[model samples]
Target: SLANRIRLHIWGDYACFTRPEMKVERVSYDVITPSAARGILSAIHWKPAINWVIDKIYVLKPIRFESVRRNRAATVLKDVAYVIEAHAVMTSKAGVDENTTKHIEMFKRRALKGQCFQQPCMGVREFPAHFALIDDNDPLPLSQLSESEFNRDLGWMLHDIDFTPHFFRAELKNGVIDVPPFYA
Candidate 1:
């Protein structure tokens, strides 16, 4: 039901979801967020280009239900939430925070040591696209569609769109890694 709703709503709506990190274009502030910075740390340890900060913040690029549903976009979404929350907690204390910085430092070290994450933690150089629960509020009708109808279509789309830089590059390891058998 949900997958059908999604397919109906956005199947031909836009260009395929492009993997941001792999873009040949220059990276901009519009693309960077405290959340994205955190994801980078989890992968490559900390980098000075996007360091912890004290400035007031606004979400330059707010999260979208559409993006979240587009295969690997959920991996970026998950990291965005966690990193923003951690940043918020640090700033909520009303001053430069040593402790929050320390925690982030630990997160970075763990990332490098593979403690905060598992070995081969990220997806391989190649990745795949699959359907996912992008937005709970996007609406699904329990009455109109059978569970069987939902899974079949979901499986077909996933199998059809099996691989793409958009699908593979945006996704991290094991998160929305493959097609769901039944739940959409």
Candidate 2:
């Protein structure tokens, strides 16, 4: 029905959205990517009946970074948080496939009620993520984000781990990145 898309305000003490090439050292995207955002949403609510699609990412914090030995981290204008715009779409996976509306309702219920099948993570489990539903009445827009006058091209990134390897041009627009979905 294409009727469900909501914004979630997610934050954490530290978030590491690892760049694919760097294996030895842990690095992060200046902002969260679509894949990580999807993971966070799935952590809060997901089912075989539905898939989450990221539409718009609102970068509430600025694009700042600082590296440290062992595990590296990014510097943000404030505590790390992002406004992700995503929708739940029906999928044909095995078992317990419910209707789109039903799935959406259930997901929202779980998100609001603080119920999750598993804990959501940023990119690595060590860097945990915390999320909350952005109020429908007062949603934050992308233009309101705090960003530095810095521009960067992240080249290609791992989109997903299905059907060979998929890559996407990881770019951040005013601290936001619009993510595309994989066609199965």
Candidate 3:
């Protein structure tokens, strides 16, 4: 059987998923990256026994950028929110009695109660992430972008981490980015 999938709705006043190449001056990505999605879930339920895989990113708010100067100039995102889908994969540390379903249940409970091992960040430490658990049949919030403005040719994005950061070309289809699998 495949891993169980769950959705988390996250929002923040400000977010900055920075583009890696231009590290000197920070510039946020067009949308939330898969790395942030995975990190948010980890903050809610981190364990050596399991790893979170961010499969989809749902942009529920309009993309707005405002360059701010706070000690230093930063290209940042404003009023950003997303519904993210992911699943937990068990690892060697997972005991014989511990299963994927167990970890999933644990995370679900934590999110429902607004609990986390660590506070979730929005790309950087400066912006905190707010999240809620979504039931399977619950309706998703309406997106702020119209059909004409919904398409985003995101180009290349930092997919996630390894010894070297993984990369992928990304596109937003109707405010959702179906992330491709990271390479070995």
Candidate 4:
């Protein structure tokens, strides 16, 4: 019932991209890029910016946790907080979809230039870092994390990705972006 009583505040611009094949409608919430926002709003369409009024909700649970290195820290934190690690398995496909090939090339070029996966491929592959959060109380029964949790975490992440130039300002400023067949 905590979730029932609590409303989450998401902030951002919602808009439909005028693609040749598809036209996306505009909405509102947090997420900087229209493309990224479309990816997010496609799932959560209730328009958090307007529908979830701040006054009606109350914070019932407080929780916090820290991130740790891969090896031992995962086990150490498992005792008290939840532990989650993200893994990579060659998301960049070397195929002829054109989209896939372009994505892989972009990733490789960025890696060669000594950029972290997170910096180079924000939407393509690199995601929010591997981290953990500790629950202060047992709101939900302790059990295996489910797909819903992953979906929620992903939604929360989409809410944070700002489409503002701040994310790729340097690359844009230096005129290094090479996305093609997609953009001129």
Candidate 5:
């Protein structure tokens, strides 16, 4: 079945897409990771019949780091917002009659009603994420930072995990980060 594309505009008072390289101290990446994005999507809606794929992430707010003592010294993002572009494909566990369109409609219905299987957090459970569904024909909201000034090498980031995790050298171009395949 054809994968129907979906988009969500998510924001929060705080976020912490922690850098794995900094195993000891909590330091966040410049933007959200694909793995975290998928986590949010799954939280919004999930079924054994479908698997979510995150395609793109748009940085909507200005990136700001707030260094505060949360008992331990840590750096986290303040006033974070993003537009996530994604879709779902049938999973191996799908029933014979199940299809992508069925899954997409169910997800939209749930999201519209503010229903979720679990709390959609930022990088951690404390920072709750708020989401709003956007239409396919609707234009994406503009970013606080222009594309030219926003371009940068985000460096190695966690894509997703199978048994072992995957990494990619991510870059943010004009407030948009194109997510590669999970194996990529």
Candidate 6:
């Protein structure tokens, strides 16, 4: 008789949590930020009754840097995979629901079944992310893919803001991040 929580093991070939201070070359935080984790969780499931609180982030992969200069796109959509139907228009309001409990269950069902309204991406749209729910019987922790240690002081990183901007000092240890509980 306790609240249900999900543990998602996510990884990607490439990821960049771009630093805001750097106005020039692209730089990333040593590990994934809390906001990015939340974004990934929301991509899987989201509801008013249920909040995605990242308890921990296990960095299975090592921090590796690869640099290359290339022309950047001015628009968000660099390529169009499929063309939208010319006659397609707003038709049905399918997701509307007054019962919060029902909506929560529906979202849970979708997440457990590996369904998403939109494809979940990493920091960049080009880099796709994959995730799997952690089984209750099998609790998975940090899986160090690389033997190298990564420790850094990512100065004044952006924390989610409400009325004002919040910043925090970020650090990496044993390739894991134990997130603080959410507070309003």
Candidate number with greatest lDDT = 3
Worst window of 10 by summed lDDT in candidate 5: 145-154
Query: Tens digits of per-residue lDDT for model 6 on 65-84?
Result: 65644364211211111100
What are the per-residue Cα lDDT tens digits for candidate 4 across 1-184?
2222221122111111111222242222211232332232222222211221111111111122233343222111111111111111222332333222333233234433344433211122212212111222424223333333322211211112233321221111111111111111
Residue pairs with clashing backbones, model 1: none
TM-score of every candidate relative to the true structure: 0.21, 0.78, 0.93, 0.17, 0.92, 0.68
Candidate 2 segments exceeding 4 Å error: 69-78, 94-98, 141-154
Local accuracy by lDDT, each model: 0.26, 0.69, 0.87, 0.22, 0.85, 0.53
Residue 152 shift from truth in candidate 5, angstroms: 1.5
Best-first order by lDDT: 3, 5, 2, 6, 1, 4
In model 4, where do residues sit more than 4 Å from their true spots? 1-97, 116-184
Tens-place lDDT digits, model 2, residues 84-156: 8888876667356455676667667777766677888766686677777765676474444434432446567
Write down the lDDT that model 2 would get: 0.69
Q: Mark the regions of model 5 whose C-alpha exceeds 4 Å error after superposition.
A: 1-3, 146-148
Q: On residues 102-179, what C-alpha lDDT tens digit does candidate 1 reach at each position?
A: 544454345434343322111221221111122335442122223332222111121112223111112112111122
| Better candidate by TM-score, 3 or 6 | 3
Give each model's clash number. Answer: 0, 0, 0, 11, 1, 0
Model 6 misplaced stretches (Cα beyond 4 Å): 68-108, 145-155, 182-184
Clashing pairs in 6: none
Model 3 shows how many backbone clashes? 0
By TM-score, rank the candidates, best first: 3, 5, 2, 6, 1, 4
